[PDB]
Amino acid sequence: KVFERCELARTLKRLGMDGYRGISLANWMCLAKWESGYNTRATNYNAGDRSTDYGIFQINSRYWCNDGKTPGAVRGDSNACHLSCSALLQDNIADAVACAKRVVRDPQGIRAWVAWRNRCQNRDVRQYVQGCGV
Template sequence: MKALIILGLLLLSVAVQGKVFERCELARTLKELGLDGYKGVSLANWLCLTRWESDYNTKATNYNPSSESTDYGIFQINSKWWCDDGKTPNAVDGCHNIHHSHAAAAAKSLQSCQTLSLRLYFPLVAWKSHCRDHDVSSYVEGCSL
């Protein structure tokens, strides 16, 4: 959980300014934060996920008309289930109102969020379609980790 909190703080602070990571830069950042092997998930899987969810862009957003929700950031965290953005009808807000436009408040909320775990990241459609049961080693290839 500590690694996810640190990761969240980093990525939320970057999201305010916006950053598109280079693949190996993100790989090094995630490794430094201790996510390589976290809960048995390889660094290559994290890179695959973020490539297909946001193309490594911390300011990526995607509106989902069918659920009237929005996916935010590098991991495309959904406003219906995880971060009530104040615009999503019937939002569950599993992380106590994480607003991505206010990094300090979001970081404080993220620290208190006990439900944020791999359940958030790996049920995502992009990971299921592009990463699960695939050879993802190319995502960290040549990164001198």
């Protein structure tokens, strides 16, 4: 599904993302925008290390979900969200949101995504939620 900007904002709000681990809703919006253009079926294979990024938040298979084809995480957690990567391609984003919450529970928080640093950090990100009623 390709979400409309305000439709997503309202969904994320209901899902409890505003201020989750200190991250404002506008930040999550900025991230979804640059990671997938608000598309839940987006997938990006990383030829470089053989991992794949899945869904609206472009969550990586090396650590967060199981796709069976990614060369492990030696021994650490290679499926920290306890999900099949397929779960991150559904139209319903409940699973992707719960996994994104797990990602930010690690020390790097939102910095885990390079796109957030490049396109959202230290920027005026109010634009992403303006007039959505959230």
